Curated annotation (Swiss-Prot), chain A:
Protein name: Serine/threonine-protein kinase ZRK1
Outcome, altering residue 53 to Y: Abolished interaction with uridylylated PBL2 and abolished ability to mediate cell death as well as an increased sensitivity to the pathogenic biotrophic bacteria Xanthomonas campestris pv. campestris (Xcc)
Subunit field text: Component of a stable high-order oligomeric complex made of RKS1 and RPP13L4/ZAR1 which recruits Xanthomonas campestris effector XopAC/AvrAC-mediated uridylylated PBL2 in the presence of ATP to form a wheel-like pentameric resistosome; this complex triggers immunity toward X.campestris in vascular tissues. Interacts with RPP13L4/ZAR1 and uridylylated PBL2.
Keywords: ATP-binding, Kinase, Nucleotide-binding, Plant defense, Transferase
Molecular functions per Gene Ontology: ATP binding; kinase activity
Function: Serine/threonine-protein kinase that confers a broad-spectrum quantitative disease resistance (QDR) to the pathogenic biotrophic bacteria Xanthomonas campestris (e.g. pv. campestris (Xcc), pv. raphani, pv. armoriaceae and pv. incanae) by restricting bacterial spread to the vascular system from the infection site; X.campestris causes black rot disease in crops. Seems to not have any kinase activity.
Effect on the protein of changing residue 19 to E: Impaired interaction with RPP13L4/ZAR1 and reduced ability to mediate cell death as well as an increased sensitivity to the pathogenic biotrophic bacteria Xanthomonas campestris pv. campestris (Xcc)
Gene3D superfamilies the UniProt entry points to: Phosphorylase Kinase, domain 1 (3.30.200.20), Transferase(Phosphotransferase) domain 1 (1.10.510.10)
PROSITE patterns per UniProt: PROTEIN_KINASE_DOM
UniProtKB/Swiss-Prot annotation, chain B:
Impact reported for residue 48 to A: Normal cell death induction in response to the Xanthomonas campestris effector XopAC/AvrAC in the presence of RKS1 and RPP13L4/ZAR1
Subunit organization: Interacts with FLS2. Interacts with the Xanthomonas campestris effector XopAC/AvrAC; the recognition of X.campestris effector XopAC/AvrAC requires the presence of RKS1 and RPP13L4/ZAR1. Component of a stable high-order oligomeric complex made of RKS1 and RPP13L4/ZAR1 which recruits X.campestris effector XopAC/AvrAC-mediated uridylylated PBL2 in the presence of ATP to form a wheel-like pentameric resistosome; this complex triggers immunity toward X.campestris in vascular tissues. Binds to RKS1 when uridylylated.
Organism per entry: Arabidopsis thaliana (Mouse-ear cress)
Positions bearing O-UMP-serine: 71
Name this polypeptide is given: Probable serine/threonine-protein kinase PBL2
Protein purpose: Involved in disease resistance signaling. Contributes to pathogen-associated molecular pattern (PAMP)-triggered immunity (PTI) signaling and defense responses downstream of FLS2. Acts as a BIK1 decoy and enables Xanthomonas campestris AvrAC/XopAC detection; X.campestris effector AvrAC/XopAC-mediated uridylylation promotes the formation of a complex with RKS1 and RPP13L4/ZAR1 which, in turn, activates effector-triggered immunity (ETI) against X.campestris. Promotes, when uridylylated by AvrAC/XopAC, the release of ADP from the inactive RKS1-ZAR1 complex, thus activating the resistosome.
Location relative to the cell: Cell membrane; Nucleus
Entry-annotated residues carrying Phosphotyrosine: 85
Full protein stretch here: 172 to 367 of 426
Swiss-Prot record, chain C:
Organism (species): Arabidopsis thaliana (Mouse-ear cress)
A Pfam family annotated for this UniProt entry: NB-ARC
Coiled-coil boundaries: 17-68
Outcome reported for the amino acid change (mutating residue 413 to E): Impaired interaction with RKS1 and reduced ability to mediate cell death as well as an increased sensitivity to the pathogenic biotrophic bacteria Xanthomonas campestris pv. campestris (Xcc)
Reported impact of residue 655 to A: Impaired interaction with RKS1 and reduced ability to mediate cell death as well as an increased sensitivity to the pathogenic biotrophic bacteria Xanthomonas campestris pv. campestris (Xcc)
Protein name, UniProt field: Disease resistance RPP13-like protein 4
Functional description taken from the UniProt entry: CC-NB-LRR receptor-like protein required for recognition of pathogenic bacteria type III effectors (T3E) such as Pseudomonas syringae HopZ1a and HopF2a and Xanthomonas campestris pv. campestris (Xcc) XopAC/AvrAC; this recognition requires ZED1-related kinases (e.g. PBL2, ZRK3 and ZED1/ZRK5). Confers allele-specific recognition and virulence attenuation of HopZ1a. Immunity mediated by RPP13L4/ZAR1 is independent of several genes required by other resistance protein signaling pathways such as NDR1 and RAR1.
Reported effect, residue 360 to E: Impaired interaction with RKS1 and reduced ability to mediate cell death as well as an increased sensitivity to the pathogenic biotrophic bacteria Xanthomonas campestris pv. campestris (Xcc)
Activity regulation behaviour: Exhibits autoinhibition activity.
Disruption outcome: Increased sensitivity to the pathogenic biotrophic bacteria Xanthomonas campestris pv. campestris (Xcc). Reduced resistance to Pseudomonas syringae expressing HopZ1a.
Outcome (variant: residue 461 to E): Abolished HopZ1a-induced hypersensitive response (HR) and loss of resistance to Pseudomonas syringae pv. tomato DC3000. Impaired interaction with ZED1
Length: 327, 174, 663
């Protein structure tokens, strides 16, 4: 069959992009067979499906003795656009190179007899965090909300700081951040990323991309992706954790609401005691509403319009890990 | 194609001296066209209001013509877009009003929103500080342009509850 | 490189004389009467290869002598793996045994007045740092720092210092020339008149240049051949790398040791002599160090441009490389630079892939078939390559390629199966397919040839994880990626007890039943084992760490490096009480929350280690002063990505790694 030349092509440009990224000094990837991964995904159409996106569909799967998360890629949405096919291999090898942190959704292999590399990962036990929370049919408590806060933050500052070249992926949604049995935030799909070259932290974005609501209005308005680009799009990614409300939110009249539109006027008006996802008011929240107020002032301060006044992700990680001091 | 657009004449790379006070007449011709283009019907939102669609004729007639989740955003690729075409996605009439306000802010001034900081970041501070344009000599003493400048200021308000409208923007201009 | 090849020839004979399985003949007594005259030749051949300089008449003869030393070792190779009636080569040697000395009648007077090194072994990290030219009162102190470098480069007996002024004043104090002539002058440092000899040898070649780019171009061709010839053959093969690529030593050290530029007889076999000759060659400052680990082992290294074109035109005047011109020694395939198809020739000592840290030599299916067209191709390492066909059925013609001793098929993707053309090869002195993430089966034909030195299947997940009886081989010195197997399957640790020669080994552990209960005590009697490495990459069940904990290493160690270890505690054998003389320690990405107190155990026992890495791990909580009072011997601690650790020294132990030197 033509799965063999599929392997010979995608392994070729996979090895190309991998050795171009990190010198061929990779992680223990391991391949699979279609008789394994198709029986894992149950032929792509089931309840072991997790969640859509533009390029890819997160599934559950199960190889012998062990379940996994699987990521496919939609071939019908990629195969005609060359920026997409040069982007997707940056995605998978950047996640492969990035698996060396204990906070990214770590990689276990990639399966290449497909047209596009339907790749396995490890198995976080809960599902994808949706634009509210845990997607398996059930709520999730408060301590894990701040835990996935700083475990988004240190992962994304591993995206910004850890290398000679710095890379942005310009959409930290709360749709991406997965969730295991030990309640850690194994952030995934480094999949809308630019790799900007050394020294300068300010490159002109050749397209302009990603997840309306989470745009960072300066990257919206100037069309250059920068060192601060995620600082906005993390901040309301914090606030989707806090209010439990989507970015494309309506109240009875045609979605004229982002959370950043609500909060910065609701601060001086409502005195911040209405932004805490009121179905989590059955939580007691005795003194740790103060850290709620601190992190939402933090979120609006890292979502403002003068980006020179924004903190950088190292500072937001340090501050929202040092607001742990309620314990 | 008759002549090209406004940045094909104004921004024609730091050249082509524009005119006297008919750039406001070009802008009100654009509004006169757009109002029956998109408001004389039940509802049409123009979706694409940017200076690369405002073309010019022999008499400088700004007759506008030729104009779902999408990840690569393209609508309002620069400061033409609205602060709640950042968070919403729905194209309302405030987006076309706000892009009309920023092209009016262009035509009184002559500066785009690029970066070496944008047009909103410098318009609403520098206010009388109506000495903003420096290319023309007859730009200052017309003094209906301070009324149009305050119209752009009231048109570039962020909230969608105290908006102008494309019909009643002709009233403050004429 | 005439002096360079006579030593590998006579040392090859010194190895192969003791077989004595072929003694009733004529062509085996003549070897002693082949090396006796070469022991006479190498008394003067060194100065002959620099009286070579500015004289054409030795390029007429001793170049052909050099090219037939390869012939002489090659017919000896033919007699080694003949296993039959190889009686036709008794007069092939006699065709030149009566003919070398007719080229020595022209060598009657040009002297008119040892295959190993002594100064190769201690390394001295000489890299201390218009700024090019310096004053003679500023050049000379740094030249003493580079040159002497044993007493931290001081001036003890002043008889050596006026001559210490007179070389460096000729080169006017431009930096890398005084670096080269300091790196040479590490070695002898004995007496005055040897420096009078090399001082005139530096003075004569500056009498006819009158150009600073021609005053430094040869300012070290004398320091190219006033060094022992086994490393003179070793510097010249890294000409085969482009202009500023950064050369990894796990390619070129294996290229040296494969086709034989490194000699050993005295027990210390393979990598302990390879990095020995590398560290010696970097004492002479021909090669500078680019990158360190935590442990101070070296990884990649670069050259300078004005010395790499020196070794290029030494190769041009040596019939060695740049194969634009067919009489060259061994090919260097670089990135899309050999569309000419350098043809099949018998000369062809080997090949090496070379890339500029970020590219891939796209290379077609035809020139791998041109690789296997050769006969004597003793290195064959095509590293950063892609292919339009699998390497199995295109390297399936190595059955016609018997005397191979090196192949590092690392980072090369169409490698789904090591080929079954690998039974009837018998030396194959190293092999490794490191970081190659697609190896569905590693063939059990490699349990037959009993001499392989490296076996890295490291960081490669997809594998059936070995053939069965790996303890049947004895000469494994480095075995990265062991991966013990299941019960009625593959290999075990209980048979790698049978090894004793290992120094650096690796093994990845996934389930609990790769290790086994009575197999847990399989690493005690490894005698010269030096650095066990571990990548416990997966644990779906907790059964791995429940009984991993009594896998004791050899007490002698140098670099313990376990890099995942999904257990939440320490492995509870990592102690001074259970491994005394370990030097280097590294913990990469895992989830070990705290450690047992038997990690420290400091009632009388301390670590006696020197370096530490705690890299990228979201689990720890230790203290810095506890680590001082527990680890009294430290140079650096490279810890970069570990939070809940901010009681430590460097400025963000969660985010950016200050390596924390000790003052």
């Amino acid at each position: 069959d033509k799965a063999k030349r599929w392997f010979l092509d995608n392994g070729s440009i996979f090895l190309r992009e991998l050795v171009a990224d990190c010198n061929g000094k990779s992680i223990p990837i391991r391949s699979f067979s279609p008789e394994q991964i198709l029986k894992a995904t149950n032929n792509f159409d089931s309840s072991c499906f997790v969640s859509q996106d533009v390029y890819y569909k997160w599934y559950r799967g199960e190889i012998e003795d062990r379940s996994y998360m699987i990521k496919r890629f939609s071939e019908d949405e990629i195969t005609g656009k060359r920026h997409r096919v040069k982007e997707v291999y940056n995605d998978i090898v950047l996640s492969a190179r990035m698996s060396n942190h204990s906070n990214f959704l770590q990689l276990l292999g990639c399966c290449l007899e497909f047209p596009f590399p339907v790749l396995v990962f490890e198995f976080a036990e809960h599902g994808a965090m949706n634009q509210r929370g845990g997607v398996i049919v059930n709520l999730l408590p408060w301590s894990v909300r701040l835990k996935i806060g700083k475990e988004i933050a240190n992962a994304v500052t591993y995206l910004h700081t850890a290398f000679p070249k710095i890379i942005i992926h310009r959409d930290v949604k709360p749709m991406h951040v997965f969730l295991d049995k030990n309640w850690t935030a194994k952030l995934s799909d480094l999949s809308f990323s630019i790799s900007l070259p050394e020294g300068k932290s300010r490159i002109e974005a050749e397209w302009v991309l990603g997840t309306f609501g989470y745009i960072d209005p300066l990257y919206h308005k100037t069309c250059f992706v920068t060192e601060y680009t995620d600082v906005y799009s993390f901040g309301i990614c914090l606030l989707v954790i806090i209010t439990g409300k989507p970015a494309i939110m309506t109240i009875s009249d045609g979605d004229l609401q982002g959370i950043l539109s609500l909060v910065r006027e609701l601060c001086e008006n409502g005195k911040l005691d209405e932004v805490i996802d009121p179905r989590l008011m059955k939580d007691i929240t005795s003194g740790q509403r103060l850290q709620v107020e601190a992190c939402v002032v933090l979120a609006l301060r890292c979502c403002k319009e003068r980006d020179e006044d924004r903190p950088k992700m190292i500072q937001v990680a340090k501050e929202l890990k040092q607001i742990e001091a309620s314990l | 194609m008759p002549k090209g657009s406004l940045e094909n004449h104004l921004f024609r790379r730091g050249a082509q001296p524009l005119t006297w006070a008919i750039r406001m007449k070009v802008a009100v011709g654009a509004a006169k066209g757009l109002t029956f283009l998109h408001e004389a019907k039940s509802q049409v939102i123009y979706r694409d209001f940017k200076a690369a669609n405002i073309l010019l004729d022999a008499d400088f007639n700004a007759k506008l013509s030729d104009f779902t989740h999408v990840s690569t955003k393209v609508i309002g690729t620069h400061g033409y877009a609205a602060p709640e075409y950042v968070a919403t996605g729905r194209l309302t009439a405030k987006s076309d009003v706000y892009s009309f306000g920023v092209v009016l802010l262009e035509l009184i001034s002559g500066r785009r929103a690029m970066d070496n900081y944008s047009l909103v970041d410098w318009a609403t501070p520098y206010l009388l500080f109506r000495i903003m344009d420096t290319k023309l000599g007859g730009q200052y003493p017309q003094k209906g342009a301070f009324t149009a400048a305050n119209l752009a200021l009231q048109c570039l308000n962020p909230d969608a509850k105290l908006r102008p409208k494309m019909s009643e923007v002709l009233v403050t201009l004429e | 490189m005439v002096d360079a090849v006579v030593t590998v020839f006579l040392e090859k004979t010194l190895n192969i004389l003791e077989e004595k399985g072929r003694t009733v003949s004529d062509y085996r007594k003549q070897l002693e009467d082949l090396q006796s005259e070469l022991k006479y030749m190498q008394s003067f051949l060194k100065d002959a290869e620099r009286q070579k300089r500015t004289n054409e008449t030795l390029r007429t003869l001793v170049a052909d002598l050099r090219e037939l030393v390869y012939e002489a070792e090659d017919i000896l190779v033919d007699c080694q793996l003949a296993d039959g009636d190889d009686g036709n080569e008794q007069r092939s040697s006699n065709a030149w045994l009566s003919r070398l000395h007719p080229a020595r009648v022209p060598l009657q007077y040009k002297k008119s007045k040892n295959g190993t090194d002594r100064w190769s072994s201690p390394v001295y990290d000489h890299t201390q740092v218009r700024p090019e030219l310096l004053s003679p009162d500023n050049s000379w102190l740094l030249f003493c720092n580079v040159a002497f470098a044993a007493n931290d480069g001081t001036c003890e007996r002043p008889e050596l210092e006026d001559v210490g002024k007179e070389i460096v004043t000729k080169c006017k104090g431009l930096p890398l020339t005084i670096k080269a002539v300091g790196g040479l002058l590490l070695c002898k440092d004995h007496v005055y008149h040897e420096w009078r000899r090399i001082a005139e040898h530096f003075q004569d070649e500056l009498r006819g240049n009158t150009s600073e780019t021609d005053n430094v171009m040869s300012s070290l061709q004398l320091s190219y051949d006033e060094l022992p010839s086994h490393l003179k053959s070793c510097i010249l093969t890294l000409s085969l790398y482009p202009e500023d690529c950064v050369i990894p030593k796990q390619q070129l050290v294996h290229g040296w040791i494969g086709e034989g530029f490194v000699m050993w007889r005295n027990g210390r076999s393979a990598t302990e002599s390879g990095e020995d000759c590398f560290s010696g060659l970097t004492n002479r400052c021909l090669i500078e160090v680019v990158d360190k680990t935590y442990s101070g082992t070296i990884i990649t290294c670069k050259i300078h441009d004005m010395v790499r074109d020196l070794v290029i035109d030494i190769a041009k005047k040596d019939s060695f490389s740049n194969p634009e011109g067919l009489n060259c020694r061994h090919l260097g395939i670089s990135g899309n630079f050999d569309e000419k198809q350098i043809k099949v020739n018998h000369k062809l000592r080997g090949v090496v892939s070379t890339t500029k840290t970020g590219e891939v030599n796209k290379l077609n299916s035809d020139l791998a078939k041109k690789f296997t067209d050769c006969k004597y191709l003793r290195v064959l390492d095509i590293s950063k390559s892609i292919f339009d066909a699998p390497l199995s059925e295109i390297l399936d013609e190595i059955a016609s390629l018997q005397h191979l001793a090196c192949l590092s098929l690392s980072n090369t993707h169409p490698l789904i199966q090591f080929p079954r053309s690998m039974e009837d090869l018998h030396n194959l002195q190293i092999l490794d397919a490191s970081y190659c993430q697609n190896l569905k089966q590693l063939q059990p034909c490699i349990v037959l040839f009993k001499k392989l030195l490296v076996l890295d299947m490291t960081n490669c997940g997809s594998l059936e994880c070995f053939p069965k009886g790996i303890g049947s081989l004895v000469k494994l010195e480095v075995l990265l990626g062991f991966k013990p197997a299941r019960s009625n399957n593959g290999c075990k640790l209980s048979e790698v007890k049978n090894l004793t020669n290992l120094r650096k080994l690796g093994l990845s552990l996934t389930r609990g039943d790769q290790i086994e209960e009575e197999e847990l005590d399989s690493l005690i009697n490894l005698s010269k084992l030096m650095s066990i490495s571990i990548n416990c990459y997966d644990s779906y069940g907790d059964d791995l760490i429940t009984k991993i904990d009594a896998l004791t290493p050899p007490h002698q160690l140098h670099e313990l490096s376990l890099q995942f270890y999904p257990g939440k505690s320490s492995p509870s054998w990592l102690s001074p009480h259970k491994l005394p003389m370990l030097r280097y320690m590294s913990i990469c990405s895992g989830n070990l929350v705290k450690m047992q107190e038997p990690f420290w155990g400091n009632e009388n026992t301390h670590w006696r280690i020197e370096g530490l890495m705690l890299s990228s791990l979201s689990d720890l909580d230790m203290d810095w002063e506890v680590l001082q009072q527990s680890m009294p011997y430290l140079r650096t601690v490279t810890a970069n990505w570990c939070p809940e650790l901010e009681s430590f020294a460097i400025e963000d132990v969660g985010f950016r790694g200050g390596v924390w030197m000790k003052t």
